Design a binder for this molecule. Structure first.
Ligand SMILES: Cn1ccn2c(CCNC(=O)[C@H]3C[C@H]3C(=O)O)nnc2c1=O
Length: 167
């Protein structure tokens, strides 16, 4: 038993809810919250900027030190950093940004990072301002992630469409 509440069951291990991921992280304090990161860990906008804003920019400060030491991530890759006030850990995962011209085939590799964690709170990778179709992202998630993933969908109308179109 875990502390996630009101999630809709898609598969044995994947649940989904219409939720603001910042508010959800604050309430649950999950072991792992997933950030929709870019390779530079520049959290200007999107989920990245939203989670970073909720940490009072401490996520960005930690991230800049990480990049200065290690260099950029790979598209499809990830790193584990602090979850600050939102979670124990933040798994920064880089899904391909379609609007930047990046290769959408890399979405499966991005979701494979989730399998290194038993339970995660996460957004739909590559969706929103990353430019991929969210229906596709959900399909890749379900077909790739084997650990327990709680998907927080911000957009109410999208949430309804994702549930009603799920095979
Ligand atoms: C406080 N907060 C919370 C969330 N948020 C977002 C989420 C952005 N959309 C996505 O990640 C797309 C997958 C689809 C969705 O989940 O609706 N953008 N800005 C914020 C923000 O300020």
């Amino acid at each position: 038993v875990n502390s996630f509440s009101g999630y809709l069951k898609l598969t044995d291990n994947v649940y989904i809810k219409n939720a603001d991921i910042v508010e959800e992280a604050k309430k649950v304090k999950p072991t792992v919250v997933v950030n929709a990161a870019n390779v530079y860990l520049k959290h200007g906008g999107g989920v990245a900027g939203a989670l970073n804003k909720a940490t009072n920019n401490a996520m960005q400060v930690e991230s800049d030190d990480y990049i200065a030491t290690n260099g950029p991530l790979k598209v499809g890759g990830s790193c584990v950093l602090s979850g600050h006030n939102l979670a124990k850990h933040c798994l920064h995962v880089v899904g391909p940004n379609v609007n930047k011209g990046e290769d959408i085939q890399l979405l499966k590799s991005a979701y494979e990072n989730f399998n290194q964690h038993e339970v995660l709170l996460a957004p739909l990778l590559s969706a929103g301002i990353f430019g991929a179709d969210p229906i596709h992202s959900l399909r890749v998630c379900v077909d790739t992630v084997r650990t327990n993933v709680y998907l927080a969908v911000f957009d109410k109308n999208l949430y309804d469409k994702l549930v009603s179109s799920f095979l």
